Design a protein around this nucleic acid. Structure first.
Ligand SMILES: [Mg+2]
Ligand SMILES: [Mg+2]
Ligand SMILES: [Mg+2]
Ligand SMILES: [Mg+2]
Ligand SMILES: [Mg+2]
Ligand SMILES: [Mg+2]
Ligand SMILES: [Mg+2]
Length: 77
RNA sequence: GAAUCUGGUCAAACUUGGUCAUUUAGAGGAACUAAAAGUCGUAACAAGGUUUCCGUAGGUGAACCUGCGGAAGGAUCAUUA
């Protein structure tokens, strides 16, 4: 499990090993985009940032906790 | 009357530390300019769509905004109508 995907952009599937508000704090400044933590009931926790920066989202997910980079399959869309 | 030699004096330089100045590398940290077809907001110029700006304090992705006290560079020189 623990699958993660990015859909035009929301990130569905996020490990809980670090606090969410600091993730938002680093995200907004390193992307320069509006950031939302939307907690829909019992779906993959929603973190939404504007623009088409999936390469930059890759950079962020590498720089936050990511060390696998193999279960990430971003849908183009 | 030479070498030698006791004392001193001027005293170069050496040995060792201390001192600062001038250059010099130095991981990395931190900017600042030009670069104008990246990025996300649209802060400011009109009542900039919440009036602007200053000092001060806080929080915040940013341009900010909020509090307190100021000013007109205000959008009023004016209610003894
Ligand atoms: Mg002598
Ligand atoms: Mg530079
Ligand atoms: Mg944009
Ligand atoms: Mg505006
Ligand atoms: Mg304004
Ligand atoms: Mg308004
Ligand atoms: Mg002036």
């Amino acid at each position: 499990s623990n699958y993660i995907h990015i859909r035009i952009t929301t990130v569905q599937g996020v490990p809980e090993e670090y606090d969410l508000k600091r993730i938002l704090k680093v995200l907004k400044k390193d992307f320069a985009c509006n950031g939302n933590i939307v907690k829909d009931p019992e779906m993959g926790e929603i973190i939404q940032l504007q623009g088409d920066q999936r390469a930059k989202v890759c950079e962020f997910m590498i720089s936050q906790l990511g060390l696998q980079k193999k279960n990430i399959k971003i849908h183009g869309f």
